């Protein structure tokens, strides 16, 4: 037997960071042929999307 060992450092923050973020629309303009949606994807430093 040999066991694969997790990196146990430099792979995850201790800081409270949301695992899954929902972006609800800023500004919509519902029309009768389409449905426009606009979001503000705010990716902070130290984040990666």
């Amino acid at each position: 037997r040999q066991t694969v060992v997790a990196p146990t450092r430099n792979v995850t923050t201790e800081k409270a960071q949301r695992l899954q973020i929902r972006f609800y629309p800023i500004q919509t303009d519902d029309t009768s042929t389409g449905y426009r949606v606009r979001y503000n994807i705010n990716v902070g430093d130290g984040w990666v999307l």
Binding site: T31, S32, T33, G34
Partner: protein
Amino acid sequence: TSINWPGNDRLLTPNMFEIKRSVALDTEGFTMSQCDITKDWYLIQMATN
């Protein structure tokens, strides 16, 4: 055969010179001066003249 001259997402309909669109069918807008002429075509003609 592929190089559209506006070709820079210039107009509200970048891929053609929409001279007129029927306002009754119009849903998104893009009609100008209280008739079926379009915003793009109105801008083009006014800028040229």
